[PDB]
C-alpha cells in the first residue's frame, strides 16, 4: 500500500517534465521561424547589384 | 481448590499484556502511515528538476 501511495510523487515529477518540454517547444518554433527570417535576409542580401543603403 | 483459585491472577496478566499490545499496535499504526508520508516526501524530493524552495 505505500508502494502504490509512492507513485504520485512520480506522476507529478513527470507532469513538470511535460510542462518545460511544452516551454522548450514552443521556443523552439518560434527560434526555427526566425532562422528562416534570417536565411532569407542573408541569401537577400548575397547578392552584388545591390546599393549600400538596402545592405 | 488452592490452585484452582490461582488462575485468577494469570487472567488478569494476560489481561494486561493484551492491552498493552493493543496500545503498541495503536502506535505502530501510526509509525505506519508516518513512515509511508516519509517516503513520499524523500521521494517527491529526489527530483533535479524542483527549485530550491519546494526542496
Redo the contacts between chains.
Keep these: ?2 508502494t502504490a ?2 507513485m ?3 506522476k ?2 513527470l507532469q ?2 511535460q510542462s ?1 518540454i511544452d516551454v522548450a517547444l514552443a521556443a523552439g518554433d518560434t527560434i526555427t521561424d526566425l532562422l528562416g527570417k534570417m536565411k532569407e535576409k542573408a541569401l537577400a542580401a548575397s547578392d552584388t547589384s545591390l546599393n549600400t543603403a538596402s545592405f
Design positions: 500500500s505505500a501511495a509512492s504520485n510523487a512520480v507529478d515529477s513538470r517534465g518545460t
